[PDB]
Amino acid sequence: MKLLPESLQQEAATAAVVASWVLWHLDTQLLPTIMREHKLHACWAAAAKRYNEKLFKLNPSY
Amino acid sequence: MAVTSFLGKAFEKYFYDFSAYEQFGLNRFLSSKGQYVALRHVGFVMVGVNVLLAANFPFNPPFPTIGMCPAGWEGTWVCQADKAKALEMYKEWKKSN
Amino acid sequence: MAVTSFLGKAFEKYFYDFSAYEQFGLNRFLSSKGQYVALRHVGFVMVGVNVLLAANFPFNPPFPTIGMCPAGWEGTWVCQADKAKALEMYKEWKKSN
Amino acid sequence: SYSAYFAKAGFQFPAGLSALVAGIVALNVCTGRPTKGTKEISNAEYNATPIGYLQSPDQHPTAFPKVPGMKDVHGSPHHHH
Amino acid sequence: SSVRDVKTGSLPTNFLTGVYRFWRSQNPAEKPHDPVNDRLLPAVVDASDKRASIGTWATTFFCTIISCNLLGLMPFNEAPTSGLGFATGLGVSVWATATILGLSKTGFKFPFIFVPLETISYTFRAVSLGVRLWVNMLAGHTLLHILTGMALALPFSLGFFSMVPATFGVCCLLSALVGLEYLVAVLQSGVFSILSTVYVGEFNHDKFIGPAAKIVK
Amino acid sequence: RLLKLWAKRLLVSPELAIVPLNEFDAQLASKFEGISPKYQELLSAVAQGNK
Amino acid sequence: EGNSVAGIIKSVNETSGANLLSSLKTIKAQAAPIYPAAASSTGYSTQAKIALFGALSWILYRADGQSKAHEWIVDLNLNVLQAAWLISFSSLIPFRAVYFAFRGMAPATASTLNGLKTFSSISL
Amino acid sequence: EGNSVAGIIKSVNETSGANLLSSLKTIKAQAAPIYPAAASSTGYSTQAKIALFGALSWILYRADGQSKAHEWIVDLNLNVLQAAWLISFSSLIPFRAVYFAFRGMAPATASTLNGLKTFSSISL
Amino acid sequence: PSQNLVSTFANKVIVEENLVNVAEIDVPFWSYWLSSAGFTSKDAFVKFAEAVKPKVAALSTSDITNLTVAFKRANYYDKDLFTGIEANVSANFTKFETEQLLQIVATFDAFNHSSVAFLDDVADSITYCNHYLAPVRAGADELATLLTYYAKNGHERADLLATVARGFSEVSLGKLSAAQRKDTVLSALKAFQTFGFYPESIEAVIGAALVSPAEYSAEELKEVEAVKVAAENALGGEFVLIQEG
Amino acid sequence: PSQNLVSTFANKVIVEENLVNVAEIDVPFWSYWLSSAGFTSKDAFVKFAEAVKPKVAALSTSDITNLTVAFKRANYYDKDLFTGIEANVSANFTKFETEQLLQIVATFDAFNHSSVAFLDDVADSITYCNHYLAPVRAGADELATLLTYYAKNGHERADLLATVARGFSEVSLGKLSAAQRKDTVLSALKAFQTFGFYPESIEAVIGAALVSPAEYSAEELKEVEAVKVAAENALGGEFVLIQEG
Ligand SMILES: [Zn+2]
Ligand SMILES: [Zn+2]
């Protein structure tokens, strides 16, 4: 059957073009979007105790 | 129609509530629905195999037959296990048929 | 810079008011401006011919020379009017030079 | 409430897919070698040969072959056998 | 020049968050002896600047191989990782990325009769990482070609829609091999990138800089 | 001006109308974590809207 | 576009006492956020047509070269075996359980947002 | 978007006699047509880049095969002869006279519009 | 006459008076890249400083950073340009980055030019409008320039000083040459005692001097040991260098 | 059992009750094309006429034309659908074309259904909202249907009659078969005398009968010659056929 390709360098470079596009697309398009909504949630969940206590000490409304 | 809006709604009500597991009864013979799908699957393969073969039946098979012949052929080009031999016999048979 | 906005404004003031017909004087020697353009045209061709030749000078000419030779070559591969002959002489000359 | 804002922009490709398709095509056409079943000949041979004799039988297999190995064209009968 | 708008909490955003956070969890950062405060924060940021991006690389190789392996299970399509140069070209490229990372830990100089035997077993990792992906995508598809030829021999010879208990038992054997191929498509993209975190994570170790001077008590 | 004060606070934050005005500083403490949770989980869910 | 709370504060300051309680539903709706309305279809974008013609141009081209592949009837009967599992996956995958299982992969959707607990930000 | 004359008629009907003559410049400008304002650049569209990369990809490809054409120095010296006339056409064509000569080819721009002569459409 | 026509073309078309006539379109692009190639040219930069003054109020933040570090490298100080620059910064202070503000301040620290509204809007932006680890990515020779610019102008922002003190560590000072590390450690300790602010990461700028005291004088080590005793009772303990291991 | 499974599939999946269950999405598309294939089916068209009634007020003009000529070919008359159709036409009368209105009127002329507001908004649209040579592109068998629908309902619009009289000529009647030309000429002259409107192009619908009077009776030619004398003194002259040349 088909074992060796017509060019091994053409198939190795197709793998490097596909996997470097996925690297570019992840780093540039996906992971900025991942971290914009992961870290809105994570900064709010980590600051929530110190944010609210800092705001309690600040507003003079009590 | 709107070409994206009609049959999307037709495929939606073919996908969802059109169910031959209940509209054709069929709970009388089948235990679950998880095994109605597990033989509608194998039924799709057996139908699709029998359609692909029959849609061009007089052909010399690329796959190895196991020593079997389809019908009254048995020595013709359809059953010939040498392919350059059967190409010669098909070209003779095509003038007659 | 903004890549479409800088040199569009630079080419605009090179196109319009940058004029070597007056900034280099040149009305002293030329009658109109319609004949300054009519030899800046021929000047562009003579400069462009002399650049295209000189940018690769040691070449056997595809065009017919009229029985003339460039410099001290005169019997080399550069002036040889048989092209399969001059391919042999260029390959010998390339090892030396 | 924002559901109808996301139905407005319809399908859209991934945000750099034209560089993937232009990179996979530029690897399949800039091979630097003849096109898989062909051989480069001289111009004197190409201008002298019919287009039925430039074709090889191996490069035109039959679209649904009744016998395995049927080819559509037959090529040059001037073999060097 | 105008980027697209993303809904928060989309399913591809939730899947790729969990996928990235999985492969990032395979090489976790090591806890310093000191407490992490504003004294230790440049040492922690510099510890992250010297670690390889294996969280990003392993989800690059997860997502490019599971997309290629599952193409082989779409109709009219073959898997690109069923090719020898594609699948082994990803395996050598992980192995070279691990080696280039481990060679730079020094000054790019390459490391009695023991060390040719550590090297061989290490240089075989190159071909074994790619050939395991290639042979799995080839041997599963090849067996499916042979058994579809056998299962076509029965309706070709016998009747169309006739003698159906013979072909039912082999159409359900063919159906359970395409189902195993969906499992091997997902497992071999996982095994390739689990192993990429292991090989690249071997050289993912640097010295914690830390405080050189302290004011105790 | 009292009616205009509470008009802004209940246009922005209408869940404030579920802590009665006399029972408000009975909830407070010195730290924010010490505030009585009688109304905390109710105020968080009325703030999320009518769905 | 200035902020809507300063629009609330301004619209409540310049009303009178008599029409304060009548104006409160038009100051409420002047400061509601925009949720854009469901426009008409204009279906199948210029890139959704490239995606479906280019996928049909791929499926026809792959089925063209599958039909002359020397194992052509085995190749064309593998597309029946492969598409049988695409059918059995539409009928067996719990798609609501899968949707809520991917929502738990992400910590952003696995919980609720957590800051700003309403007793800290009052203005009395 | 209703018509601006019915907006003029309504805005002049519900004004008083005292503030009629002051309101006439804000009813004038409420019924002026929109002339959209000069936005920021965002230069070189996604199709102006295809048009200039595709023209550079054509000029390089045509100069590539011109340079191996067996008359390659004659082919490359014809692009100098052809581009010399593109330069002499930028310096000799009267481009304002050509613009107003094409405006006379079209009867729509060769004259002024002609209907509705103002004494027929008064409303006294 | 080939040499005559080229020499005539060279003395009337390619000069620096037409090099500054194509440079009038986008100023801070051409101002920045020419000054990086070594083109100081004090009265060619005056043509820049008036061609850009109707534009400084609407520049992007990377344009403002390009003006100030070009006019720093050319060493030219236009006081009515540099008030339009600080009115771009103090009007768009949320959009500037610590990478950009640490280069704008070092221009404003050479040319001794400050405002109180500018010193607050740079400190408000580094502390609140920018990531809190942006000092860690800065390099301690730029942070010491920011520390002294707030001590020259007598501006005590104790929130800014806790932010800039993150970017002093063994990591950030180890990337400096020991000529430049010494010029930074003395410059950072002189600013830390001017406010009397001794953070817990002062023990990395002190320990950058006491681990190699053979580059320092006894006058400068008296300056260092004055800050060490001033920081020891503030942090509540005694200094101790660590031998690694 | 291959024949049994197909026959069981055919009696429960492909029937006309599921053919009208996919036809519920877009009604006037499926209503029009099925009726052109010969699918009348009077009580399958009642499922159409109620599935489309919440949509008739927002249909495009080519959808409304598709409803009426489908419900004409299926001969089904739903009076509370056909008032929603005429309220689509008389609310969007500027958007309809003479090609579309001449097919809507011929449906409304079979099913004797009219309004005065509809008869004005069809006549306002053919005369003013449509090109004045759109009757010339119509074919005179459709214009005679419009002429009698205005004479049945007693509606005298003398501006519409000058418009429809353009589309009567030797050209438009010559494209008719002489069975259909006779049914049109008598139908057009009966409407032209009901209003007493004798335009200058009545001498082409009269001359379409007097050039071949062997297809007409003496009763119908008395009808024709009544209109000829009525039009001769209106136009101020005498009729004369022309031998060509
Ligand atoms: Zn296959
Ligand atoms: Zn040419």
DSSP string, A10-50: HHHHHHHHHHHHHHHHIIIIIHHHHHHHHHHHHHHHHHHHH
Instruction: Please state the φ and ψ torsions of residue F12, each to the nearest 5 degrees.
Output: -75, -50
Q: How many CA atoms lie within 13 A of J212 on its CB side?
A: 13
Could you say which of I12, I21, I26 has the minimum Cβ distance to residue C6? I26
- What gap in Å lies between CA G51 and CA C36, rounded to an integer? 57
- Cα–Cα nearest to I241, from I200, I207, I209, I208: I207
A25 touches chain D (CB under 8 A): yes
CA I75 to chain centre: 14
Q: Which amino acid type is present at position E100?
A: I
**CB pair distance less than 8 Å for C23 and I25:** no
Q: Is I218 exposed, middle or buried (0-12, 13-18, 19+ CB in 10 A)?
A: exposed
Question: How far is the centre of ligand 1, averaged over its atoms, from the C-alpha of G75 (Å)?
Answer: 5
Give me the residue spans of the domains in chain E: 1-217
DSSP line for H3-17: -HHHHHHHHHHTS-S
Q: Which amino acid type is present at position F21?
A: L
Give me the residue spans of the domains in chain I: 26-135, 136-242
Give how far C13 is from chain I: nearest CA, Å: 9
I238 touches chain E (CB under 8 A): yes
Per the DSSP assignment, residues forming a β-bridge with I238 are: E216
F8 touches chain G (CB under 8 A): yes
- What gap in Å lies between CA A16 and CA E61, rounded to an integer? 11
Q: What residue has token string 């309902």? A: J153
* Residue E145 counted as an annotated binding residue: yes
Q: Which amino acid type is present at position I182?
A: K
Give how far A9 is from chain F: nearest CA, Å: 58
Strands I238-241 and E213-216, by their bridges, are: antiparallel
CA E99 to chain centre: 17
Give how far A62 is from chain E: nearest CA, Å: 33
Question: How far is the centre of ligand 2, averaged over its atoms, from the C-alpha of H75 (Å)?
Answer: 5
Q: What's the DSSP call for residue D80?
A: -
Give how far G44 is from chain D: nearest CA, Å: 7
Q: How many CB atoms lie within 10 A of CB I21?
A: 15
Residues of D in contact with G68 (CB under 8 A): 61-65
Residue I72 near residue I36, CB atoms below 8 Å: no
Residues of E in contact with B68 (CB under 8 A): 153, 156-158
Give the method of determination: cryo-EM
Contacts of H4 (CB under 8 A, 6+ apart): H30, H31, H33
Nearest CA in chain I to E33: I245
Token duo for residue I155: 């501006």
> Within chain J, where are the H helices?
2-10, 16-19, 27-36, 45-51, 61-73, 82-89, 98-110, 116-127, 140-152, 158-164, 170-174, 178-195, 207-210, 218-235
Q: What residue has token string 């008009």? A: F7
Token duo for residue H87: 């330069």
- What gap in Å lies between CA E8 and CA G103, rounded to an integer? 11
Per the DSSP assignment, residues forming a β-bridge with I241 are: E213
Question: Looking at the CA of E71, which ligand is closest?
Answer: 1
Could you say which of B4, B15, B61 has the minimum Cβ distance to residue G44? B4
Q: Which helix (H) or strand (E) holds G31?
A: none
Residues of A in contact with E13 (CB under 8 A): 33-34, 37
* Residue E78 counted as an annotated binding residue: yes
Which resolution, in Å, applies to this structure?
Answer: 2.9
Residue F44 near residue G119, CB atoms below 8 Å: no
**CB pair distance less than 8 Å for G122 and F40:** no
Q: What's the DSSP call for residue J132?
A: T
Token duo for residue G103: 């929502």
Q: Which residues of J touch B (CB under 8 A)?
A: 8, 12-13, 21-22, 25-26, 29-30
DSSP line for F1-51: -HHHHHHHHHHH-GGGGGS-STTSTTS--SSGGGS-TTTHHHHHHHTT---
- Cα–Cα nearest to J191, from J167, J161, J222: J161
**CB pair distance less than 8 Å for D63 and G47:** no
Question: Looking at the CA of E77, which ligand is closest?
Answer: 1
Question: Looking at the CA of G66, which ligand is closest?
Answer: 1
Q: How far is CA B79 from CA B58, B61, D65, G52, J150, in A?
A: 10, 8, 15, 42, 78
Rounded CA Rg of chain A: 25
Which of D6, D17, D27, D66 best tests the E interface by mutation, with the highest count of E CBs <10 A?
D6
- What gap in Å lies between CA B75 and CA B86, rounded to an integer? 10
Question: Looking at the CA of H67, which ligand is closest?
Answer: 2
Per the DSSP assignment, residues forming a β-bridge with E213 are: I241
- State the helix-helix crossing angle for E84-104 and E115-157, rounded to 10 degrees: 160
Give how far E55 is from chain I: nearest CA, Å: 21
- What gap in Å lies between CA J74 and CA A37, rounded to an integer? 58
Nearest CA in chain A to E5: A33
Per the DSSP assignment, residues forming a β-bridge with I239 are: E215
Q: Which chains touch D (3 or more CB pairs under 8 A)?
A: A, B, E, G
Residues of H in contact with C61 (CB under 8 A): 73
Give how far A41 is from chain G: nearest CA, Å: 5
Please report the residues numbered 46 through 65 in chain D whose beta carbons come closer than 8 angstroms to any beta carbon of chain B. Answer: 64-65
Q: Which helix (H) or strand (E) holds E70?
A: none
Give how far I227 is from chain E: nearest CA, Å: 13
Q: How far is CA B64 from CA E138, E148, G67, J101, in A?
A: 21, 10, 18, 68
Do F and J make contact via 3 or more CB pairs under 8 A? The reply is no
**CB pair distance less than 8 Å for G27 and F27:** no
Q: How many CB atoms lie within 10 A of CB D21?
A: 13
Q: Is the dihedral of CA J213, J214, J215, J221 positive or negative?
A: positive
Taking the CA atoms of residue C40, residue C44, residue C50 and residue C55 in that order, the dihedral angle to the nearest 10 degrees is 140
**CB pair distance less than 8 Å for A48 and G116:** yes
The angle formed by the CA atoms of residues B5, B6 and B9, to the nearest 5 degrees, is: 85
**CB pair distance less than 8 Å for D11 and G67:** no
G96 touches chain B (CB under 8 A): no
Q: How far is CA D61 from CA D57, D74, J6, in A?
A: 7, 10, 37
Please report the residues numbered 13 through 72 in chain B whose beta carbons come closer than 8 angstroms to any beta carbon of chain G. Answer: 15, 34, 37-38, 40-41, 44-45, 48-49, 52-53, 59, 61-63
Helix, strand, or coil (residue C18): coil
Q: Which helix (H) or strand (E) holds B15?
A: helix B6-15
Residues of E in contact with I206 (CB under 8 A): 213
- What gap in Å lies between CA I87 and CA I115, rounded to an integer? 10
A33 touches chain D (CB under 8 A): no
> Within chain I, where are the H helices?
2-10, 16-19, 27-36, 45-51, 61-73, 82-89, 98-110, 116-127, 140-152, 158-164, 170-174, 178-195, 207-210, 218-235
**CB pair distance less than 8 Å for A53 and F33:** yes
Could you say which of G58, G82, G106 has the minimum Cβ distance to residue E73? G82
Residues of F in contact with A52 (CB under 8 A): 32
A17 touches chain E (CB under 8 A): no
Residues of C in contact with I21 (CB under 8 A): 13
- What gap in Å lies between CA J91 and CA J81, rounded to an integer? 15
